[PDB]
RNA sequence: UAUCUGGUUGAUCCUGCCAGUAGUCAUAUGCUUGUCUCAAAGAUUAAGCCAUGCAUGUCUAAGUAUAAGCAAUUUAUACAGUGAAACUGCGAAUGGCUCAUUAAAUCAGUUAUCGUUUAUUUGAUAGUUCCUUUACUACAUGGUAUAACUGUGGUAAUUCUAGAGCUAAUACAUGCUUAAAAUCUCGACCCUUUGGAAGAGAUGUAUUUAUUAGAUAAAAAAUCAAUGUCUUCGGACUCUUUGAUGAUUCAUAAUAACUUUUCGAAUCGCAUGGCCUUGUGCUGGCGAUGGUUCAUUCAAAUUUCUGCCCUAUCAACUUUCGAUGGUAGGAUAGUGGCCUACCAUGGUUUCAACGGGUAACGGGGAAUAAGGGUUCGAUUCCGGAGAGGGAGCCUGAGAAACGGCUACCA
RNA sequence: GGACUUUUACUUUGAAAAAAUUAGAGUGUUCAAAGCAGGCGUAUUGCUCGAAUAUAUUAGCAUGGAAUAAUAGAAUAGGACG
RNA sequence: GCCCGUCGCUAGUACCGAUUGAAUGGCUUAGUGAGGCCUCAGGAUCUGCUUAGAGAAGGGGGCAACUCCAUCUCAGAGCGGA
C-alpha cells in the first residue's frame, strides 16, 4: 500500500558467450586495472552504452534544438566534470567516440595509484577498501 | 411522423399548463407554446404552425438539446416519431497503419415538425433519455429527398 | 429458563421475531432484529417459575411480604415532580423540599441532594431574553440593508435616466 | 425488492445480458399505493436521504380548482368515472393522476351564487354594486352548468396521491371537457 | 462504492503539495470546505511541510488547537483544513501574515505580506443568482455567499472582500485588457493582462492571455482569475510574477548568481 | 542497441525445420553462500475448510451523575471536584483482503444532469406559531415512561433475560411568543353621484394543485369587456420596472386554495455587570449545541462519443414471461419498457449480429532494446466486484452491509 | 442582434489533461541502486537554491492549411441572382 | 545396391463402441414455496379526547344572586390513537 521503492540494474552482459578475442581484451582490462569481475567491466560498458545512445538520439535532432541544446550540453558538462571528456573535444561527437578505458582510468582505484600512494593497482585496492 | 387525428389517444393530448380560457372568445381555438434549441437551430415553420403535441419535441415539447450534436444518414423510418440513422466512419489501425470502414446505428427521436425519408442526411442533438435506446433528437434536415422527382416519367 | 411473553397465547414455546422496545429482547445494534424462542403466556406443567403480583391482601400476614417494607430508593429530581410528590403549587420554592441523603464517610457523615432540572433560573431567563433580542436586532438589520439596496437600485435607475438624458 | 435497473432486460441488439453485481438499494422501486375513495388513511414512507413521501390509501376529500374562475375549493370526491391507462381503475374507483372523477359542486355553487348573484341551472347594497359590476362574466358555459344541475362536476386529477398524499385536480372545461364527454358516453 | 471516502493514499495526493514519495503511506485528506480537494492545501502541510514550524503532525495539531493560526479572520482548529487560493493565513504570534497564491511552477508558494493587506480578500464570482424573498446574491470561488451586490457584477468578474466584515467593497469586470492570474492547467501560476476570448456557446470559452514579455498562451475561462490592471494587481505578487522561464533560461539564471 | 552458428550430400548450391545463443518485476528447484544498503512474499491449485487471540469504538468549561463511588476541601442546603455504570449523540457505509463472476459489462479518454439525491464542512438565512380576537391560553418554563440502580428470579448452556420497585434529558411526546406597514376580500350604515366608507377577516415558511408575472425582433394606431394613478371635469396617462442561460414552463415573484401540518430554541458552559420608577423589576458579555431554506464542499446516481482476446465444425438473432416505439399512469431521489395498461410492428447483422471459448477483472502499466512489433499485467495508485452460495431487509445522510439481521442450500 | 449556410477524410498548432512508472535536468546518498534533497554564515537566537522539462498517439473539443481523395449542384430547368 | 505391402513380437498414443453409460458447471420449464417488505383484518394492554354523576381543592371579586385556568379520584356514554 506504500510507494514502490524503485530500482534498476547497472550491468549488461555480452551476447556471444565465448568469443576468445573479447575475452582476451576483457582480461587485459581486468589485470591492468585490478578488477575482480568481468562484471566491473560489463557495468561500465553498459553505462557508457547508455550515454552513446542518448548521444545518437541527440545527433539526429536539428542543430540548436532546445532539447539538444539543454540536455546535450548538460551531458557534456557532466562528462567533463569527472575527467572522461577532454576540454578540447567537447561537442558530443567525441561522446559518440569515447571508450571504456577513459572511464576505467578515472576511478579512485586508478587515481590513488597513478600518482604514487600504491606502486600497484592491487595495493590501491587493498588500501582503499581498508579505511 | 404522426399525422392526422391529433387527438387519437385514450388520454387528452394537451401542452401542459397552457390554459386557454373558454369564456375568452379567441379566433385561434388553442394557445400554442414554443421556444428555440439554440446553437444556431432555427425552429421550423411547421412546428409553430402545426397542431401536433409531442412532449418529446425539441421546439414545442418538454426536452432540451445539450451535449453532443451529431449528423448521420437515415437508414430507418419504419417506426413512429422515431428513426434510426447510420453514422459511418473509418478506424485507424496502427500495426497496419491503415483504416477500416465502421459504422454505428444511432436511435433518435423525430418530431412531427419534420418530414423525414430514408436517405435524408440529418443533424441530431443529444437530450435526456427519451426512451430505452433514445438519447438524441432530430434537430435539422440537411438533405431533401435525394432528387426523387428527378426520376419522373417519359414525355 | 425461557421467558413468557404477554399476549402470545398457546401454552407452548414459539419462536418469534423480536424487535426494538419489546419484551424478552434487548438489541445490540441500531434496528437489529432477532428471531428468538419464547414461552407462551398460558400457564402449564413446564413452568419452573410463576411471576405473580398481589392485587388484594387476605386475612393473614405473609412473612417477608406484608410484614416488611422497603423504600423507593430514589426521590423526585425534576422541578414539578418535586412539586407534585408533595403538592406545593408553583410558589413555595423547590430548593428546600428536595430529599437529601446522608452518608457517613467514616467520621464525616455527608449530605447529598439531586440537582433540580427544568427549574426556572436567572440564567435561563437571560438566554431567552438574548434569543428574542438577537432575533429582532437581525430583523431590523436585514430591513435596513433592504432599504440600502432599495436606495442603490433607485439612484442607479436615476443614473440610467441621467445617462439616457445625456445622449 | 423491485429493481428499476436496466442491467437485466435484453440489449437493443437482442443479446441476453449477464449478471454483473447484485441488487443495489438505490436502484429500488416500491409497490403501488393503489389508492381509493373514502375516509382518510395516509402512510408516510421514508425515502432516500430522509424526505418522507406520503402515500394515500383511501381518501375522501380533495382540493379542486375552477381554472377559469380564478378560484379553488375543497370538495368531497364522489367517484372515478374514467381513466386512460386502465379501465380497472374506474370499476374499482381507484384514485390516480389524470383519472376523471366527479366532485361535489355545492361549494362551487355557493361561491358562484355568492359572487355573481345569478344562481346556476335552469339584496345587500354593496353586494348589488358588485353583482352589477360583474356580469359580462357570468356566461358559465353550457356543459359546466348542465354539469351543475346534477350537482357533480367532471374533474381531472393532477396531483400524485400515492406520492404526495393529496388528491388535487382541476375542473373540466372546453376542448378537454368535450373530449372526455364524447369519450365518456360513447363507451357506456 | 458504499459511501464517502475518508482516507487519502499519499501517491494520489495532488503533486503541487510536494510530499515525498516514501516515508509513511497516507496523506492528509483535506476536509470539506470552501475549496475543491485537488486545489486546496491542508493547514498541516502549510505549518509543517511549507513553513517548518513543526515536525510531528501531532505537534501541528497541538500548535493549531492553541488557536495560534487563524484563516481569513476565524481561528480554525481543523488540522486538515481545506485552505486554498486567496485565503489569508494569520499568525498573531510570530507576527506573520500569509496569502495563498500560486507560483509559476504551479505550486502554492510561501508569500509574506503586510498586516494591512491581510485584512481584505479577493474573490472571483462563480455565480450570481436571484434569491428567495427577491434578494439577489453573488457567490465567489471560495463559497463566500454575499447578498445585495452591485447590479453591474456578472459571472467571472472579480471582487474585493472585507474579511473582518462581509460586504464587497470594490470590483473589477471581465473586459479585454485585465491583469489575470491563471488558476489551472499547466499554464497556471502565470500572469498576463488578457488578450481575447474565444466564445464557443455551451462548450468551454477559451481565454487568450499575454504576459509582460510579449509571450502568449491560451486557456479556458474556468482557470482564469481576474486580478487587476496593466502592471497594477490588487494583491502582492511573488518573485517572478508569472512569466515562466524556459528550462535553459532558468538554467542560466540559477547558475548566473554563482560566485560563492 | 541493424551479427548468427552446428545437423540432409561423396561433394555443392538451396528449401526448411530441429538444436545452440541472449534477456525476462519470471515461477520452481538443485549445489554453494562471508560484509553493507534495499525488501517482494499462500496470486497460479481449492472465492477450499478453519482451533484460539486480536483487528471499532468514542467526552468537551459546554446533553444526562443522589454510584448507598473515590477525593475531600475550599464557600458552596438545588447541582457544581473527579468519576464506573447506563441514557443520548456521532461512528461502525472508511479502512484492510481477494480477483470469484464479469466480453459492449467493467475500465479508459471524453461528456451530460434544462434528469436527480447528498451527513458533513464553509458562507448565507427566520419579528407573523394563540383566537369571534375584554372577564383569557403555564412561558418566572407544561407531561411521563425508562435504563443504569435496588431487590426477587429462571436455564447444562450465549454479550439470554422475566416479575417487582425507583429516576434524568439537547431521549420521548407536547406547547406559548415580538415592531411598523401595506396588499387583498367581504362589508354596517348614507345616497344617488362620477360614487366613499367607518371596522370585521385573511396575508411567517414549508407542503399539494390551478392560475398569473418572468418583457426586449425596429416602430405606430381604432374598438369592446373589465379599471387603475393625477383632474386644468372636453380628459389626458408623461418619465414608467427589469436578472440568467447557446437553450427552459429557469432563478424570483403574485392570486385562489389545500395539509392526520415541516420549520420558526421549553437546551448547555464560563463569567456575572450595567441602569432606577428599589420591583429578586427591566436589561446586558463571550461561544456551545441545535434549527428551516439557499449556496459551498465531500460525495453519489445515472449518462454522450469512441475503443476489447480467441472463435463460422456459431448466420441469423430479438418479442415465453418487453423484444424496438407511441400514450397515460404507477413506482424512483429523479431520466427511462424501470414496471403496468392500451396500441403498433418494430430493434441488431459478413463494416460479423446472435451464440460459444477464455487456466478474462479493466486501466496506469511490465518484459524484449535498429525500426515496425511481440508478449504480459491476480499483485504497492485509480475504477469495479465479493465476503461459503443465493435471495430478502433493518438502521441510516449514505449499505441491498455480511468483523449487521432474516430465510433457504451446502 | 437578425437573417442562412452541401457534407467529409488528411495535416498543423493548442487546450483539457493524477501520481508513481519511463526519458531526463539539478544535488557528491563516502561510491552505487536510490532519496528529493540540500547548500551557506555571524555554527549564541539566519541565510538561501530547489522539489525541473519531455512523452502522454486512438476518440471528443479548439485553431491554421486548401495540395491529395471523396461528396453535393442547373437538363422534362421544378434553376441563378433583382 | 536401394526398396514396397500383407503377415508375427514388445511399448505408447489417439479414434469407433452395447452400456440411450457416467461426472462437474452455467442456464432453465412445470410443480411445490421459506423469508423479510407492502396491504385488507386482528386487539394480550394502555392510554387517550369527548358526555354526565358522586366528595374536596383554587377564586374571575359581592351584603344575598354571580364566576375562569391549570392537577388529581370512582358506577356510567359518544369519537379516534398507540
Swiss-Prot record, chain A:
Q: Which GO terms describe its biological process?
A: maturation of SSU-rRNA from tricistronic rRNA transcript (SSU-rRNA, 5.8S rRNA, LSU-rRNA); ribosomal small subunit biogenesis; translation
Q: Which GO terms describe its molecular function?
A: rRNA binding; structural constituent of ribosome
UniProt keyword annotations, A-Z: Cytoplasm, Isopeptide bond, Nucleus, Phosphoprotein, Ribonucleoprotein, Ribosomal protein, Ribosome biogenesis, RNA-binding, rRNA processing, rRNA-binding, Ubl conjugation
Subcellular location(s) per record:
Cytoplasm; Nucleus, Nucleolus
Q: What is its main location?
A: cytoplasm
> GO cellular component terms?
90S preribosome; cytoplasm; cytosol; cytosolic small ribosomal subunit; nucleolus; nucleoplasm; small-subunit processome
Similarity comment text for this entry: Belongs to the universal ribosomal protein uS4 family.
Give the function comment from the record.
Component of the ribosome, a large ribonucleoprotein complex responsible for the synthesis of proteins in the cell. The small ribosomal subunit (SSU) binds messenger RNAs (mRNAs) and translates the encoded message by selecting cognate aminoacyl-transfer RNA (tRNA) molecules. The large subunit (LSU) contains the ribosomal catalytic site termed the peptidyl transferase center (PTC), which catalyzes the formation of peptide bonds, thereby polymerizing the amino acids delivered by tRNAs into a polypeptide chain.
Miscellaneous comment in the UniProt entry for this protein: Present with 106000 molecules/cell in log phase SD medium.
Protein's name in the database: Small ribosomal subunit protein uS4A
Give the originating organism: Saccharomyces cerevisiae (strain ATCC 204508 / S288c) (Baker's yeast)
Gene symbol here is RPS9A
From Swiss-Prot, chain C:
Ubl conjugation among the record's keywords? yes
For the cross-link Glycyl lysine isopeptide (Lys-Gly) (interchain with G-Cter in ubiquitin), the position is 57, 72, 90, 155
Any one GO CC term of the record = 90S preribosome
Which biological processes are named by the entry's GO terms? Answer: maturation of SSU-rRNA from tricistronic rRNA transcript (SSU-rRNA, 5.8S rRNA, LSU-rRNA); translation
Q: Which UniProt keywords apply?
A: Cytoplasm, Isopeptide bond, Nucleus, Phosphoprotein, Ribonucleoprotein, Ribosomal protein, Ribosome biogenesis, rRNA processing, Ubl conjugation
Is Cell inner membrane there in the keyword field? no
State any single GO MF term: structural constituent of ribosome
- Write down which residues bear the modification named Phosphothreonine: 104
Spell out the subcellular localization from the entry. Cytoplasm; Nucleus, Nucleolus
Q: What does this protein do?
A: Component of the ribosome, a large ribonucleoprotein complex responsible for the synthesis of proteins in the cell. The small ribosomal subunit (SSU) binds messenger RNAs (mRNAs) and translates the encoded message by selecting cognate aminoacyl-transfer RNA (tRNA) molecules. The large subunit (LSU) contains the ribosomal catalytic site termed the peptidyl transferase center (PTC), which catalyzes the formation of peptide bonds, thereby polymerizing the amino acids delivered by tRNAs into a polypeptide chain.
Misc remark: Present with 66000 molecules/cell in log phase SD medium. There are 2 genes for eS6 in yeast.
Entry similarity comment: Belongs to the eukaryotic ribosomal protein eS6 family.
What's the name of the protein?
Answer: Small ribosomal subunit protein eS6A
Source taxonomy: Eukaryota, Fungi, Dikarya, Ascomycota, Saccharomycotina
Please give the range of the full-length protein represented by this chain: 60 to 226 of 236
Curated annotation (Swiss-Prot), chain D:
GO annotation terms (biological process): maturation of SSU-rRNA from tricistronic rRNA transcript (SSU-rRNA, 5.8S rRNA, LSU-rRNA); translation
Region annotation Disordered: residue ranges? Answer: 1-30
Phosphoserine occurs at 65, 68, 72, 85, 142-143, 146, 149
What GO cellular-component annotations does this UniProt entry give?
Answer: 90S preribosome; cytosol; cytosolic small ribosomal subunit
Q: Where are the transmembrane segments?
A: none
CDD domains the record matches: Ribosomal_S8e_like (cd11380)
Fill in the misc note: Present with 15900 molecules/cell in log phase SD medium.
What's this protein's name?
A: Small ribosomal subunit protein eS8A
- Please name the source species: Saccharomyces cerevisiae (strain ATCC 204508 / S288c)
Its ancestry begins with: Eukaryota, Fungi, Dikarya, Ascomycota, Saccharomycotina
Curated annotation (Swiss-Prot), chain E:
Which sequence positions carry the modification called Phosphothreonine?
114
CC terms in the record's Gene Ontology section = 90S preribosome; cytoplasm; cytosol; cytosolic small ribosomal subunit
Where does this polypeptide localize? Answer: Cytoplasm
Q: Which GO terms describe its molecular function?
A: RNA binding; rRNA binding; structural constituent of ribosome
Grouped into one coarse class, the protein's main location is cytoplasm
**Keyword Cell inner membrane tagged:** no
GO BP annotations, alphabetical order:
cytoplasmic translation; translation
**Tell me, what's a Pfam family for it?**
S4
Domain (S4 RNA-binding) ranges: 41-104
Q: Does this entry carry the keyword Nucleus?
A: no
Which residues are annotated with the PTM Phosphoserine? 31, 246
Quaternary state and interactors? Component of the small ribosomal subunit (SSU). Mature yeast ribosomes consist of a small (40S) and a large (60S) subunit. The 40S small subunit contains 1 molecule of ribosomal RNA (18S rRNA) and 33 different proteins (encoded by 57 genes). The large 60S subunit contains 3 rRNA molecules (25S, 5.8S and 5S rRNA) and 46 different proteins (encoded by 81 genes).
This molecule's function is given as: Component of the ribosome, a large ribonucleoprotein complex responsible for the synthesis of proteins in the cell. The small ribosomal subunit (SSU) binds messenger RNAs (mRNAs) and translates the encoded message by selecting cognate aminoacyl-transfer RNA (tRNA) molecules. The large subunit (LSU) contains the ribosomal catalytic site termed the peptidyl transferase center (PTC), which catalyzes the formation of peptide bonds, thereby polymerizing the amino acids delivered by tRNAs into a polypeptide chain.
UniProt name for this protein: Small ribosomal subunit protein eS4A
Source organism of the structure = Saccharomyces cerevisiae (strain ATCC 204508 / S288c) (Baker's yeast)
Give the taxonomic lineage as stored in the record: Eukaryota, Fungi, Dikarya, Ascomycota, Saccharomycotina
Amino acid at each position: 500500500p506504500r510507494a514502490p521503492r524503485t530500482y534498476s540494474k547497472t550491468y549488461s552482459t555480452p551476447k556471444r558467450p565465448y568469443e576468445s578475442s573479447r575475452l582476451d581484451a576483457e582480461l587485459k582490462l581486468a589485470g591492468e586495472f585490478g578488477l575482480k569481475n568481468k562484471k566491473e567491466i560489463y557495468r561500465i560498458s553498459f553505462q557508457l552504452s547508455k550515454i552513446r545512445r542518448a548521444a545518437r538520439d541527440l545527433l539526429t535532432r536539428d542543430e540548436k534544438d532546445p532539447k539538444r541544446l539543454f540536455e546535450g550540453n548538460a551531458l557534456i558538462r557532466r562528462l567533463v566534470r569527472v575527467g572522461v571528456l577532454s576540454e578540447d573535444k567537447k561537442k558530443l561527437d567525441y561522446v559518440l567516440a569515447l571508450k571504456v578505458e577513459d572511464f576505467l582510468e578515472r576511478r579512485l582505484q586508478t587515481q590513488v595509484y597513478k600518482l604514487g600512494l600504491a606502486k600497484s593497482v592491487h595495493h590501491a585496492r587493498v588500501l582503499i577498501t581498508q579505511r | 411522423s404522426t399525422e392526422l387525428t391529433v387527438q387519437s389517444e385514450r388520454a387528452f393530448q394537451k401542452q401542459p399548463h397552457i390554459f386557454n380560457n373558454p369564456k375568452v372568445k379567441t379566433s385561434k381555438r388553442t394557445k400554442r407554446w414554443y421556444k428555440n434549441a439554440g446553437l444556431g437551430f432555427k425552429t421550423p415553420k411547421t412546428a409553430i404552425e402545426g397542431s401536433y403535441i409531442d412532449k418529446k419535441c425539441p421546439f414545442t415539447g418538454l426536452v432540451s438539446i445539450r451535449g453532443k450534436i451529431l449528423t448521420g444518414t437515415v437508414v430507418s423510418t419504419k417506426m413512429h416519431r422515431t428513426i434510426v440513422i447510420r453514422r459511418a466512419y473509418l478506424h485507424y489501425i496502427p500495426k497496419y497503419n491503415r483504416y477500416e470502414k465502421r459504422h454505428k446505428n444511432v436511435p433518435v427521436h423525430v418530431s412531427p415538425a419534420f418530414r423525414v425519408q430514408v436517405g435524408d442526411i440529418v443533424t441530431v442533438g443529444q437530450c435526456r433519455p427519451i426512451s430505452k435506446t433514445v438519447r438524441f433528437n432530430v434537430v435539422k434536415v440537411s438533405a431533401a429527398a435525394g432528387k426523387a422527382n428527378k426520376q419522373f416519367a417519359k414525355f | 429458563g425461557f421467558p413468557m411473553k404477554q399476549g402470545v397465547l398457546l401454552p407452548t414455546r414459539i419462536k418469534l421475531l423480536l424487535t426494538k422496545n419489546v419484551s424478552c429482547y434487548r438489541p445490540r445494534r441500531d434496528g437489529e432484529r432477532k428471531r428468538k424462542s419464547v414461552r407462551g403466556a398460558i400457564v402449564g406443567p413446564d413452568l419452573a417459575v410463576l411471576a405473580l403480583v398481589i392485587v388484594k391482601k387476605g386475612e393473614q400476614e405473609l412473612e417477608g411480604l406484608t410484614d416488611t417494607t422497603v423504600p423507593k430508593r430514589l426521590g423526585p429530581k425534576r422541578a414539578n415532580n418535586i412539586r407534585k410528590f408533595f403538592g406545593l403549587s408553583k410558589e413555595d420554592d423547590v430548593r428546600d423540599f428536595v430529599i437529601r441523603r446522608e452518608v457517613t464517610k467514616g467520621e464525616k457523615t455527608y449530605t447529598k441532594a439531586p440537582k433540580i432540572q427544568r427549574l426556572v433560573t436567572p440564567q435561563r431567563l437571560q438566554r431567552k431574553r438574548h434569543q428574542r433580542a438577537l432575533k429582532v436586532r437581525n430583523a431590523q438589520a436585514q430591513r435596513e440593508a433592504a432599504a440600502e439596496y432599495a436606495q442603490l437600485l433607485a439612484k442607479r435607475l436615476s443614473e440610467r435616466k441621467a445617462e439616457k438624458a445625456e445622449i | 425488492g423491485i429493481s428499476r435497473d436496466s442491467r437485466h432486460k435484453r440489449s437493443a441488439t437482442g443479446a441476453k445480458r449477464a449478471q454483473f453485481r447484485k441488487k443495489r438499494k438505490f436502484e429500488l422501486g416500491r409497490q403501488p399505493a393503489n389508492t381509493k375513495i373514502g375516509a382518510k388513511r395516509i402512510h408516510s414512507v421514508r425515502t432516500r436521504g430522509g424526505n418522507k413521501k406520503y402515500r394515500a390509501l383511501r381518501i375522501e376529500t380533495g382540493n379542486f380548482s375552477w381554472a377559469s374562475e380564478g378560484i379553488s375549493k375543497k370538495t368531497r370526491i364522489a367517484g372515478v368515472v374514467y381513466h386512460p391507462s386502465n379501465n380497472e381503475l374506474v370499476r374499482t374507483n381507484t384514485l390516480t393522476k389524470a383519472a376523471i372523477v366527479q366532485i361535489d359542486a355545492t361549494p362551487f355553487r355557493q361561491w358562484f351564487e355568492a359572487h355573481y348573484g345569478q344562481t346556476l341551472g335552469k339584496k345587500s347594497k354593496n353586494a348589488e354594486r358588485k353583482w352589477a359590476a360583474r356580469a359580462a362574466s357570468a356566461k358559465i358555459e353550457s356543459s359546466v352548468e348542465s354539469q351543475f344541475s346534477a350537482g357533480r362536476l367532471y374533474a381531472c386529477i393532477s396531483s400524485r396521491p400515492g406520492q404526495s398524499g393529496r388528491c388535487d385536480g382541476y375542473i373540466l372545461e372546453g376542448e378537454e371537457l368535450a373530449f372526455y364527454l364524447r369519450r365518456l358516453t360513447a363507451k357506456k | 462504492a458504499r459511501g464517502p471516502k475518508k482516507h487519502l493514499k499519499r501517491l494520489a495526493a495532488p503533486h503541487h503539495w510536494l510530499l515525498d514519495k516514501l516515508s509513511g503511506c497516507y496523506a492528509p485528506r483535506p476536509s470539506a470546505g470552501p475549496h475543491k480537494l485537488r486545489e486546496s492545501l491542508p493547514l498541516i502541510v502549510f505549518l509543517r511541510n511549507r513553513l517548518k514550524y513543526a515536525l510531528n503532525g501531532r505537534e501541528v495539531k497541538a500548535i493549531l488547537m492553541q488557536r495560534h493560526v487563524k484563516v481569513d479572520g476565524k481561528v480554525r482548529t481543523d488540522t486538515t483544513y481545506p485552505a486554498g487560493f486567496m485565503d489569508v493565513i494569520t499568525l498573531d504570534a510570530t507576527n506573520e501574515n500569509f496569502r495563498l497564491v500560486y507560483d509559476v511552477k504551479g505550486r502554492f508558494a510561501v508569500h509574506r505580506i503586510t498586516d494591512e493587506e491581510a485584512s481584505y480578500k479577493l474573490g472571483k464570482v462563480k455565480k450570481v443568482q436571484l434569491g428567495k424573498k427577491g434578494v439577489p446574491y453573488v457567490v465567489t470561488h471560495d463559497g463566500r455567499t454575499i447578498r445585495y451586490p452591485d447590479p453591474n457584477i456578472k459571472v467571472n468578474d472579480t471582487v474585493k472582500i472585507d474579511l473582518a466584515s462581509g460586504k464587497i467593497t470594490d470590483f473589477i469586470k471581465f473586459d479585454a485588457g485585465k491583469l489575470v492570474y491563471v488558476t489551472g492547467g499547466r499554464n497556471l501560476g502565470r500572469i498576463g493582462t488578457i488578450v481575447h476570448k474565444e466564445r464557443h456557446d455551451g462548450g468551454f470559452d477559451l481565454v487568450h492571455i499575454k504576459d509582460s514579455l510579449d509571450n502568449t498562451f491560451v486557456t479556458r475561462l474556468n482557470n482564469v482569475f481576474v486580478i487587476g490592471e496593466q502592471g497594477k494587481p490588487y494583491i502582492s505578487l511573488p518573485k517572478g510574477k508569472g512569466i515562466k522561464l524556459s528550462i535553459a533560461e532558468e538554467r542560466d539564471r540559477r547558475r548566473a548568481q554563482q560566485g560563492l
